[PDB]
């Protein structure tokens, strides 16, 4: 996990790509041939 300190808090990121891509991977899976 990637680790970042920002504005008094610690953020752990669990994925290697870009954030925009992360959000898209969720959306595309949720909407793939939905009814």
């Amino acid at each position: 996990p990637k680790t970042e300190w920002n504005a008094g808090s610690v953020i752990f990121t669990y994925f290697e790509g870009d954030i925009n891509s992360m959000v898209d991977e969720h959306f595309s899976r949720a909407l793939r041939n939905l009814k």
Partner: protein, 215 residues
Amino acid sequence: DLNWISMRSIASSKLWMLEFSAFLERNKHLFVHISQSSPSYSDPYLETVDIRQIYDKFPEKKGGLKELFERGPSNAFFLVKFWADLNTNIDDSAFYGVSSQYESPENMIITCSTKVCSFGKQVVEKVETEYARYENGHYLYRIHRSPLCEYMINFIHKLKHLPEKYMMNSVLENFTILQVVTNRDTQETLLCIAYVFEVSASEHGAQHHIYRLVK
């Protein structure tokens, strides 16, 4: 063994939630919000949900919800269903924040972990730590205006841009947040709240339902 409060509200024997809000302001709009008032004995028992019913929506094995429940005390565990209010034009540059407040009889140092899970796999986690301030005759913990992960800003922008509310709900059905509040010294789970989401069917307004997790 301070159970009466926890059967009736979001609280363990050692911490009680006053407020939780996620919002956007340039002025203000609440996506989701919880606000508890002082528990009365005459308040109803919360509804209970069997925890094994939600395990597959949060991480499992080592760092997981099941393991956590088996260890930290069982009266610490709650499930909140939110109906989020995404109907705001403030997003079309502005501040996205989450604020929360807890009271306790004990003076502690607490960490609050909020973890975004997609299809049960963990994605991002923000960890905040807060010291106690004495007030009336309790200790107050106030985690004020913390910015929201860019993951969530991006997610909210895209969630809002979907054309049909069934699609919003499909996106939300495998989206969860897990909040874990811990005592930093003894690391004793003080509160664990599992969040699940739909979008509100009102044109404006956010709603919630609070359940107590069991067994």
